[PDB]
Amino acid sequence: MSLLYVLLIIPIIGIFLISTIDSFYFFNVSYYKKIALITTILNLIVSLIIYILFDFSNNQFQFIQENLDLSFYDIYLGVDGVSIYFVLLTTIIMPIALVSNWNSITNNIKSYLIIMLLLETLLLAVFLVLDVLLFYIFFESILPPLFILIGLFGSSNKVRASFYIFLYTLLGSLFLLLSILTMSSIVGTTYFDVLLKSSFEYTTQLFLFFGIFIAFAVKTPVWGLNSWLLRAHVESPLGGSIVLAAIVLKLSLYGVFRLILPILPQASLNLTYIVYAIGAITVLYASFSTLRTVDVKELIAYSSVAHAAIYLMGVFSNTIQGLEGAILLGLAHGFVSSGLFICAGGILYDRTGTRLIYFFRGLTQIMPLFSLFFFILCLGNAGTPLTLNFVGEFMSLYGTLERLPIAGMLASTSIIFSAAYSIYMYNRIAFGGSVSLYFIDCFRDLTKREFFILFTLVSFTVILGIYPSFVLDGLHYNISSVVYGIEPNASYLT
Amino acid sequence: RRATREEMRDAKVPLAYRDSCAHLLIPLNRCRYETYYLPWKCEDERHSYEKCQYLEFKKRVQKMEELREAKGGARSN
Amino acid sequence: LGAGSVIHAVADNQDFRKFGGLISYLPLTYSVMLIASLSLVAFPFMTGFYSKDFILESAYGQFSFSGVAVYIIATIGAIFTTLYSVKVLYLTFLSNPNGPRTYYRLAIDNFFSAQAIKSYKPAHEGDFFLTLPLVILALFSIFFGFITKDIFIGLGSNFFVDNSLFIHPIHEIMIDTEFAVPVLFKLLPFIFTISFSVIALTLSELLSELVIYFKFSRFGYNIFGFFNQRFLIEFFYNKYITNLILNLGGQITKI
Amino acid sequence: MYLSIIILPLLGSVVSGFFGRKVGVSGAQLITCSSVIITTILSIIAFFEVGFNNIPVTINIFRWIDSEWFIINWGFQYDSLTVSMLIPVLIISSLVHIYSISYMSSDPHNQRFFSYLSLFTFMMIILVTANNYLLMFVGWEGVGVCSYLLVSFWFTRIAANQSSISAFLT
Amino acid sequence: RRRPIEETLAEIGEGRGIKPPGYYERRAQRLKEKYGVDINPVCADPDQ
Amino acid sequence: KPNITGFDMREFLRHTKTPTYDPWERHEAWRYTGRFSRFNRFKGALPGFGIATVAFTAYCVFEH
Amino acid sequence: VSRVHRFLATGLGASMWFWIFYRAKKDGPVLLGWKHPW
Amino acid sequence: GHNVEEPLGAAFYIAVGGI
Amino acid sequence: NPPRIKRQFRDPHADWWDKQERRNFGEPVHEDHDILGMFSPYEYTWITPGKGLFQIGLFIASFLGLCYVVKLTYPDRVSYPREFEGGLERELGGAGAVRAFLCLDD
Amino acid sequence: GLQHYKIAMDPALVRLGSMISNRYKYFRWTKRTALVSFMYVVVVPSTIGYLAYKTDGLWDLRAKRRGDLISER
Amino acid sequence: QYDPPTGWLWGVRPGEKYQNEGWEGPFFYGFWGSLIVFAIAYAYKPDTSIQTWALEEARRRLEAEGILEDPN
Amino acid sequence: PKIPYPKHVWSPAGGWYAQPANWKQNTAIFGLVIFGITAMVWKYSAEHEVRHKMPEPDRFYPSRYWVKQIKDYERAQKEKQ
Amino acid sequence: PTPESEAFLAKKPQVPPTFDGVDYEDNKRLKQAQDAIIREQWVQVMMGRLVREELSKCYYREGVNHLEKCGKLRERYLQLLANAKVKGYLFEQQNYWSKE
Ligand SMILES: CCCCCCCCCCCCO[C@@H]1O[C@H](CO)[C@@H](O[C@H]2O[C@H](CO)[C@@H](O)[C@H](O)[C@H]2O)[C@H](O)[C@H]1O
Ligand SMILES: CCCCCCCCCCCCO[C@@H]1O[C@H](CO)[C@@H](O[C@H]2O[C@H](CO)[C@@H](O)[C@H](O)[C@H]2O)[C@H](O)[C@H]1O
Ligand SMILES: CCCCCCCCCCCCO[C@@H]1O[C@H](CO)[C@@H](O[C@H]2O[C@H](CO)[C@@H](O)[C@H](O)[C@H]2O)[C@H](O)[C@H]1O
């Protein structure tokens, strides 16, 4: 078998072992939790093996398997530079997502581990599939496990939060399905190699655009359609929050490099001013209302909306720099949003049972290790240099300015507004006076568990900020394939 | 004699000072190099450079005294 | 660092209205800050003399409306610099003591009987790690301008001839600033500093009633509060920019 | 030597900040002050090196950002303007360090304070020694983060927390 | 799979990174008609 | 026209002086005497001037 | 008040007021127009 | 004065060994 | 909803439970609690916004008028512009770059 | 779930946080809420979008030197 | 009069020791161990980037011109 | 007067008045590792600094003694006649 | 010139950077045309990168008079800057330009 199918079977094998260990011993929950964690590490070791062998300048899909047997629906796995880093991000997060929530679950622990081990397979598949209906199949197979993750292990407003995520994601994704079905009808298959050769008529493209963008606008999400995230992320367990922000919010970002940039170019060009108008508005409104949010975990969720808008305008720039910056800002968001969710949902909520910023003040005085990491993750949310978040924003913002200058000029105001809320949240929890008086007893500082996942996430954010060429050298040639345009003296060569 | 534009180029004279009196700036900046720009060691070469620049300033001062009266004391700046 | 030294001596008080005397109590600090204040006003032959006074005569040296304008504006701005330099040096060291006796009660006079061992605390100078920086920076403040005037001012100096500081021959005004500017405007900032300094010293020491007359007039009440409140720029920023953004966030969130 | 002017203030900051417990107030003060004194001496030499001899110095370490038409390096240029700025930056930084031993003697948190002092000197060196505008922006933002850290050094006081918001956001 | 160049330039148009061969000469004609200024970029070499 | 309070600002400024009699007179008398007399406050307002003036005259007499 | 801060205070003051009039004696006539730097 | 002594720590060696 | 009053107008010397915030443990909170506390934008109470615009206008009017007197009576340039051999056109970048003064009008 | 440390939960702040959470259940359509909603959701995006269309492809800065014009169109 | 250094790292009081919760084994040996082994392997990864390929051709075109000197 | 503080709080920077009794030994050890680290960056500088103008033979320029580009130049220039 | 590296034989295109006379249903010939065009656009942009590195050394070598010594390099960089961008093959693949 191939090496991309080993990525999928290992999390499935872990599901089987958790389900059968009680049949060999009444077994401890600690034994269930070591199985799930060792299983996620092995997937991460395979994924690092794949990256060692990967060819950074190859236009053919790699690590494929000769099917040679065709059915109505068949799984085709391959890897290109555009997808390798999304796979790696999924395989670094899932181990931390389990470790972060190691003590906080308490009840239904096997069910919790099985859903995450199942989510890892489904989110890994969505990057590995070489068809657009298979992309849709896994881009939407994650909705039943996430409905039950929030309902079983979520917070107080969990029932409504889980109904919002499922119904919005189901509704938005059913307009994508209509567009995909139309392309398959006109071409006869959704396999990428055959679909990317095909050129659609402008009118077909302009209606295929209306339907892929409606799906992506709901799943980005844009400002007037972001209600599900404000509920889903907050009421979700800590581990579910880490997956939904770092990995699920990136499915729409990676879906533009497949469903829009290569097959609907004329539509993307003539409609970019609509995208940029929306993206600009969701940069401003999201940021203004992130300043006045009183739930800390919902202040981290709102921050994600503003960042997704910068990377959405980057994917619509028709520029090499804004396209690579969009992937860098999505990788950067994956580490930093994970840390800020760990701080809000996994350290404060663990010690106080509250998420209201009214109750927190002067936390640096009694918890100096938490405040150090919390400061670094707030600076990265603010796009400070020396973090990968700055590189992605700069390249995403430059391609936005080069495409349509005015919108990138409004979008550049994210430098003042992301800074505003990030420091304001920081000064109100870590600083802002002496330790609050609402704390009856003293709180312990970071545990060796809390410290080492925060340190690991910060380490990826800073090291990749210094030397982004670790990710940039892989995307160059493959990004080169999604640009639409010619130059008058460089084209049509004889 | 005046320094050639090649000589001013080859002695790295600042552009704004590639004027007629740059032949005195050649040794002055040379004296400044050897003396580490101490303000009491290259007095005579500054004086000659300073004096010469005064003379062309005076000629350019008179060169408007005819111009100003040609326009009846009108604004010229 | 000199102001920091008087804040340290006077129990972390930072208000001029509670500082007085102190000249005999902090002799090194006063002289060192006198060193600094003379170069801040660009008193002749100080370090700041060669830098600030060449900016003024270079503004008039560019015989343009904008240059003569900024020369007048900057010269007025220099007048007020001399005023608040006297204020600092008079109210902190030279005026009658305006703060509690604790900063000025020595042991040469006995105010106590059974507590003579402690509890005097009379505004003393600090230790070696405090004074050493102040002495070094004083020597710079006297001589560094002279010793480096050629490296920077020069006349055809080639220190920045690696295109680190590119001046285009069209914008060169150095030669006119050396020769064209009249001696009156060249010397004008000096007379203003010497004349205002004595005028403000008399109005602060000899004739102290007049300023009380100004601030107790409704005209001067508004002029004193206008400049104390920093042109009300803070006022209009919080009310119309900062609070406006916080209302906009609330309206988006609520409505 | 030239790349050692850049590196020394950074190392003293890291010892004082992440290893203040091991070195203590005295050891943090000594390592922080000595590293910036050494850097100051090496910078006075570099003024004679570069400016008085008209020898610019170029050093590139590795690339920071690599794209189409975009190649921004972790590179440093020493010219007449660079060494001119370094002298007030490093003379004043050295003296304020020595000064701060007496001024902040009674404060509880000396290791954190002296760490922020060295962090500011490192960032100010990065701002004036860069080859390009984007690495100069790292020092620009870095000096801003360090000014926020030093305006808000006494986090208990709310006035300080308002004033550091002003510095950061303006 | 491929279409006439004229067909696509009709829906999107030249510009926005779509610089078809001959874009600069046409732009000169377009800019001259609308701005009334002839485009003549400077040399950048003192020699030739 | 006059306010109910006896406060008049013209009369307020008239009393901006050193009062002839003051109940607190002796409590404040230390701030204008000794180290804080007129002479003592400005005795050393120019620290090095006296030493420098005589020293500079010694250098100034170089004709002989 | 210590003697050291006293000697330093007047010494720093006597540093100026010697440079000041030395610089005036040497560069005064040129500054106030009576001379020219040559 | 006290005698409490602080060891160099494991973070010291991981950083030095890492470098 | 209580009155929307900034807590910087409360007494700092009252027996507040939280002295730093000037609050008590049970007292009702306005819905705008975030931006009404001690850690919020300051409220300057020196003068009224309308009177402030007046005084900003008077500063500006005074500074524009000073500019107006300077434009009436300010000197003319006293020396002719300095003339370069060939305009230094080679040393300043060639014909395709701006050069210095060279036998032109004034 | 896990026991947390003791917090002096302020009844006033708890009911305020409850108020913010259930607030939507009481939104009505007034002359005021419509005016704010129409401004934010229609007017501002339509104004930003209109300028985006009018200035689209209007300018390019690459390699443009003196004698050339920034305006593409 | 500096005080002794204090505190409980990981919240472990001066009496007892850190108790291993369970995650520590795999996370230190497997998660981090894989990254060091990935880091050492990445050094010997051959460079298949487009630029290392494009620089060498670009040099051979500019060497055919006075812009770049050729070693031949 | 020193502030009362909690003694269970662990901080990497020491906390409130932290000076160990081994402070001198630890400070000595950190000095050597600083000196060793700054010795590697110096040897990097010597071999990687780039100059387009070499110094004069008799003119004070202490870089002459450790930078390879200059040392290659001055040794080559020390071969004539 | 500089010898052609061993790594520069495995990735060297075997086809001209064009789509004319390329059967699209032959995927092998089509992907190599895609690769040939991308590699040319990239050589052009690294050509400008290398000219920019020489310009910088001429700038730090000539200092004040770089404005009269570095003009040839300035020409070449400004030529390349207006002509080399990585624009992809997608437009090229989907349109034919007759050149007549
Ligand atoms: C398409 C449908 C949606 C799919 C979404 C993914 C759902 C995944 C669910 C995981 C499988 C069910 O998980 C199952 O939970 C029940 C809880 O009653 C456990 O069952 C046991 O739980 C605990 C274990 O101590 C006991 O107290 C309880 O008495 C017993 O029933 C099973 O051992 C576990 O395997
Ligand atoms: C683009 C437009 C929107 C796209 C589609 C999105 C539609 C989302 C609609 C979801 C509506 C909420 O769905 C409904 O929420 C209520 C909560 O109020 C839930 O009700 C539940 O929560 C309440 C909360 O008090 C509890 O008493 C109890 O747990 C249960 O009754 C219902 O079980 C759920 O069906
Ligand atoms: C960095 C982000 C922003 C970058 C994008 C914004 C660039 C803005 C460029 C504005 C100038 C564009 O190009 C400019 O257009 C104006 C008209 O508007 C024209 O301006 C022209 O006006 C008059 C006619 O009224 C002409 O006689 C004159 O020669 C010229 O000044 C020229 O064509 C050009 O000077």
Coordinates of N, CA and C in Angstrom, one line a residue, chain A residues 155-246:
Chain A
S155 N -19.7 23.2 27.0 CA -20.0 24.1 28.1 C -21.6 24.2 28.3
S156 N -22.0 25.2 28.9 CA -23.5 25.4 29.2 C -24.3 25.6 28.0
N157 N -23.9 26.5 27.1 CA -24.8 26.8 25.9 C -24.4 25.8 24.8
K158 N -24.1 24.6 25.1 CA -23.6 23.6 24.1 C -24.7 23.2 23.1
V159 N -25.9 23.0 23.5 CA -26.9 22.4 22.6 C -27.1 23.4 21.5
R160 N -27.3 24.7 21.7 CA -27.5 25.7 20.7 C -26.2 25.8 19.9
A161 N -25.0 25.8 20.5 CA -23.8 25.9 19.8 C -23.6 24.8 18.8
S162 N -24.0 23.6 19.2 CA -23.8 22.4 18.3 C -24.8 22.4 17.1
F163 N -26.0 23.0 17.4 CA -27.0 23.1 16.3 C -26.5 24.2 15.3
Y164 N -25.9 25.3 15.8 CA -25.4 26.3 14.9 C -24.4 25.8 14.0
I165 N -23.3 25.2 14.5 CA -22.2 24.7 13.6 C -22.8 23.7 12.6
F166 N -23.6 22.7 13.0 CA -24.0 21.7 12.1 C -24.8 22.3 11.0
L167 N -25.9 23.1 11.4 CA -26.9 23.6 10.4 C -26.3 24.6 9.4
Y168 N -25.5 25.6 9.9 CA -24.8 26.6 9.1 C -23.8 25.8 8.1
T169 N -23.0 24.9 8.6 CA -22.0 24.2 7.8 C -22.7 23.3 6.8
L170 N -23.9 22.7 7.2 CA -24.6 21.9 6.3 C -25.3 22.8 5.2
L171 N -25.9 23.9 5.6 CA -26.5 24.7 4.6 C -25.5 25.3 3.7
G172 N -24.4 25.9 4.2 CA -23.4 26.5 3.3 C -22.8 25.5 2.4
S173 N -22.5 24.3 2.9 CA -21.8 23.3 2.0 C -22.7 22.7 1.0
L174 N -24.1 22.9 1.1 CA -24.9 22.3 0.0 C -25.0 23.2 -1.2
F175 N -24.5 24.5 -1.1 CA -24.4 25.3 -2.3 C -23.1 25.0 -3.0
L176 N -22.1 24.5 -2.3 CA -20.8 24.0 -2.9 C -21.1 22.7 -3.7
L177 N -22.0 21.9 -3.1 CA -22.3 20.6 -3.8 C -23.0 20.8 -5.1
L178 N -23.9 21.8 -5.2 CA -24.5 22.0 -6.5 C -23.5 22.5 -7.5
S179 N -22.5 23.3 -7.1 CA -21.5 23.8 -8.1 C -20.6 22.6 -8.5
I180 N -20.2 21.7 -7.6 CA -19.3 20.6 -7.9 C -20.1 19.6 -8.8
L181 N -21.3 19.4 -8.6 CA -22.1 18.5 -9.4 C -22.2 19.0 -10.9
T182 N -22.3 20.3 -11.0 CA -22.4 20.9 -12.4 C -21.0 20.7 -13.1
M183 N -19.9 20.9 -12.4 CA -18.6 20.7 -13.1 C -18.4 19.3 -13.5
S184 N -18.8 18.3 -12.7 CA -18.7 16.9 -13.0 C -19.6 16.5 -14.2
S185 N -20.7 17.1 -14.3 CA -21.7 16.9 -15.4 C -21.0 17.4 -16.7
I186 N -20.3 18.5 -16.7 CA -19.8 19.1 -17.9 C -18.5 18.4 -18.3
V187 N -17.7 17.9 -17.3 CA -16.4 17.3 -17.6 C -16.4 15.8 -17.5
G188 N -17.3 15.2 -16.7 CA -17.4 13.7 -16.6 C -16.6 13.1 -15.4
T189 N -15.8 14.0 -14.7 CA -15.1 13.5 -13.5 C -14.7 14.7 -12.7
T190 N -14.3 14.4 -11.5 CA -13.8 15.5 -10.6 C -12.4 15.3 -10.2
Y191 N -11.7 14.3 -10.8 CA -10.3 14.0 -10.6 C -9.5 15.3 -11.0
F192 N -8.6 15.7 -10.1 CA -8.0 17.0 -10.4 C -7.3 17.1 -11.7
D193 N -6.5 16.1 -12.1 CA -5.7 16.2 -13.4 C -6.6 16.5 -14.5
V194 N -7.8 15.9 -14.6 CA -8.8 16.1 -15.7 C -9.5 17.4 -15.6
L195 N -9.9 17.8 -14.4 CA -10.6 19.0 -14.2 C -9.8 20.2 -14.4
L196 N -8.5 20.2 -14.1 CA -7.6 21.4 -14.2 C -7.3 21.6 -15.7
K197 N -7.3 20.6 -16.5 CA -7.1 20.8 -18.0 C -8.3 21.6 -18.5
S198 N -9.5 21.3 -18.0 CA -10.7 21.9 -18.6 C -10.9 23.4 -18.4
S199 N -11.4 24.1 -19.4 CA -11.7 25.5 -19.2 C -13.2 25.8 -19.4
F200 N -13.8 26.4 -18.4 CA -15.3 26.6 -18.4 C -15.6 27.9 -19.1
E201 N -16.8 28.0 -19.6 CA -17.3 29.3 -20.2 C -17.4 30.3 -19.1
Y202 N -17.2 31.6 -19.4 CA -17.3 32.6 -18.4 C -18.6 32.5 -17.6
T203 N -19.7 32.4 -18.3 CA -21.0 32.4 -17.5 C -21.1 31.2 -16.6
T204 N -20.6 30.0 -17.0 CA -20.6 28.8 -16.1 C -19.7 29.1 -14.9
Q205 N -18.6 29.7 -15.2 CA -17.6 30.1 -14.1 C -18.3 31.1 -13.2
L206 N -19.1 32.0 -13.7 CA -19.6 33.0 -12.8 C -20.7 32.4 -11.9
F207 N -21.3 31.4 -12.4 CA -22.3 30.7 -11.5 C -21.7 29.6 -10.7
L208 N -20.6 29.0 -11.1 CA -19.9 28.1 -10.3 C -19.2 28.9 -9.1
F209 N -18.8 30.1 -9.4 CA -18.3 31.0 -8.3 C -19.3 31.2 -7.3
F210 N -20.5 31.6 -7.7 CA -21.7 31.7 -6.8 C -22.1 30.3 -6.4
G211 N -21.6 29.9 -5.2 CA -21.9 28.5 -4.8 C -20.7 27.9 -4.2
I212 N -19.5 28.2 -4.7 CA -18.3 27.9 -4.0 C -17.9 29.0 -3.0
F213 N -18.2 30.2 -3.4 CA -17.9 31.3 -2.5 C -19.0 31.4 -1.4
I214 N -20.2 31.1 -1.7 CA -21.2 31.0 -0.6 C -20.9 30.0 0.4
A215 N -20.3 28.9 0.0 CA -19.9 27.8 0.9 C -18.7 28.4 1.7
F216 N -17.7 28.9 1.1 CA -16.5 29.4 1.7 C -16.8 30.6 2.6
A217 N -17.7 31.5 2.2 CA -18.0 32.7 3.0 C -18.6 32.2 4.4
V218 N -19.5 31.2 4.3 CA -20.0 30.6 5.6 C -18.9 30.0 6.4
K219 N -18.0 29.3 5.7 CA -17.0 28.5 6.5 C -15.7 29.3 6.7
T220 N -15.5 30.5 6.2 CA -14.3 31.3 6.5 C -14.2 31.6 8.0
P221 N -15.2 32.1 8.8 CA -16.4 32.7 8.2 C -16.3 34.3 8.1
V222 N -17.2 34.8 7.2 CA -17.3 36.3 7.0 C -18.1 36.9 8.1
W223 N -18.1 38.3 8.2 CA -18.8 38.9 9.4 C -20.3 38.6 9.6
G224 N -21.2 38.8 8.7 CA -22.6 38.6 9.0 C -23.0 37.1 9.1
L225 N -22.0 36.2 8.9 CA -22.3 34.8 8.9 C -21.4 34.0 9.9
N226 N -20.9 34.7 10.9 CA -19.9 34.1 11.8 C -20.5 33.7 13.2
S227 N -21.9 33.7 13.3 CA -22.5 33.4 14.6 C -22.3 32.0 15.1
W228 N -22.1 31.0 14.2 CA -21.9 29.6 14.6 C -20.5 29.5 15.3
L229 N -19.5 30.2 14.8 CA -18.2 30.1 15.4 C -18.2 30.8 16.8
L230 N -18.9 31.9 17.0 CA -18.9 32.6 18.3 C -19.6 31.6 19.3
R231 N -20.5 30.8 18.8 CA -21.1 29.7 19.7 C -20.2 28.5 19.7
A232 N -19.9 27.8 18.6 CA -19.2 26.6 18.5 C -17.9 26.6 19.3
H233 N -16.9 27.5 18.9 CA -15.6 27.5 19.6 C -15.7 27.7 21.1
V234 N -16.5 28.6 21.5 CA -16.7 28.9 23.0 C -17.3 27.7 23.8
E235 N -18.3 27.1 23.3 CA -19.0 26.1 24.1 C -18.4 24.7 23.8
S236 N -17.5 24.6 22.8 CA -16.7 23.4 22.6 C -15.8 23.1 23.7
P237 N -15.4 21.8 24.0 CA -14.3 21.5 24.9 C -13.0 22.1 24.4
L238 N -12.0 22.2 25.3 CA -10.7 22.7 24.9 C -10.2 22.1 23.6
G239 N -10.2 20.7 23.6 CA -9.6 20.0 22.5 C -10.4 20.3 21.2
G240 N -11.7 20.3 21.3 CA -12.5 20.6 20.1 C -12.2 22.0 19.6
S241 N -12.0 23.0 20.5 CA -11.7 24.3 20.1 C -10.4 24.4 19.4
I242 N -9.4 23.6 19.8 CA -8.1 23.7 19.1 C -8.2 23.2 17.7
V243 N -9.0 22.1 17.5 CA -9.2 21.5 16.1 C -10.0 22.4 15.2
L244 N -11.1 22.9 15.7 CA -12.0 23.8 14.9 C -11.3 25.0 14.4
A245 N -10.5 25.7 15.2 CA -9.8 26.9 14.8 C -8.6 26.6 14.0
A246 N -7.7 25.8 14.5 CA -6.4 25.5 13.8 C -6.6 24.7 12.5

